[PDB]
Amino acid sequence: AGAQDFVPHTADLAELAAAAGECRGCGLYRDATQAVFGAGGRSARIMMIGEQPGDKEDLAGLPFVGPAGRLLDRALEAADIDRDALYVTNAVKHFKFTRAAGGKRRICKTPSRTEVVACRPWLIAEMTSVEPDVVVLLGATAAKALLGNDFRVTQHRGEVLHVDDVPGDPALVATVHPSSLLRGPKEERESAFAGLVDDLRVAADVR
Ligand code: SF4
């Protein structure tokens, strides 16, 4: 059942994170430095979920510490959301990567659907533990983990969604991943930043 047996029977986030350090639910634990669990407390009303820890996250032991995390910090501030009141995590908790000759960083490789399904028990334990009012899904992998493998982030922008098989029926808001707004023509990046702010504001408004 993937990571299921590695998940202990607790809602204590420090205990879950320690256990995630021992997970072998898929092959990704082998080459990753460490498991990167979510950060934040169980009082959090807003949960945010990216794809996976990237290069910086793999070594920091924390989510959203890179350029993508800093852009998200700028978006959250513009949306009047405090990052300390958020629970932030990723669909899979081990960095999947390769290197290219001459590169300046390790390159993220897309988790397969199998890896996403294997690791989802941790996501479920996190949601059980935090009981968020709203889940922001940042990018396609995270959105598909909860909304199904055919889901298209691009076709449901700014929509409050609810699926039946999700812990605590929280509202779900699927949006672009902060990494997508780092490059491109200035006017498209600025339009996209506004869209992300809008989606974050939709999520924060959820009753
Ligand atoms: S990615 Fe998830 S399921 Fe795979 S080894 Fe890491 S914690 Fe376990």
Q: What angle do CA 185, 191, 192 make, to 5 degrees?
A: 85
Q: Which protein residue's CA is at the shortest distance from atom 4 of ligand 1?
A: 26
d(CA 68, CA 164): 31
**Rounded to an integer, what distance in angstroms lies between the CA atom of residue 4 and that of residue 188?**
41
94 is in an annotated binding site: yes
The residue to which tokens 């909304």 are assigned = 147
**Is 95 a pocket residue for ligand 1 (Cβ < 6 Å)?**
no
The full set of domain ranges for the chain reads 1-207
Distance CA 27, CA 111 (A): 11
Q: Which residues make beta-bridge pairs with 135? A: 47, 172
Give the neighbor-by-neighbor strand order of the sheet with 86-90: 86-90, 46-50, 134-138, 171-175
What's the CA gap between 133 and 31, in Å, rounded?
A: 35
The rounded distance, in Å, linking the Cα atoms of 106 and 66 is 13
Instruction: Give the distance (Å) from ligand 1 centre to CA of residue 23.
Output: 6
Count of helix runs (H) and strand runs (E) in the chain: 6, 6
15: amino acid identity, one letter = E
- For residue 20 and ligand 1, the question of a CB distance below 6 A is answered with yes
CA distance 191 to 134: 24
DSSP state of 190: H
Cα 32 to middle of ligand 1, angstroms: 10
Method used to obtain the model: X-ray
Is 37 near ligand 1, meaning CB less than 6 Å away? no
Task: Name the one residue in this structure whose structure tokens are 């983990």.
Answer: 145
* Spatial separation of the C-alpha atoms in residues 177 and 167, rounded to whole Å: 23
Phi, psi of 42 (to 5 degrees): -70, -15
The amino acid that residue 75 corresponds to is A
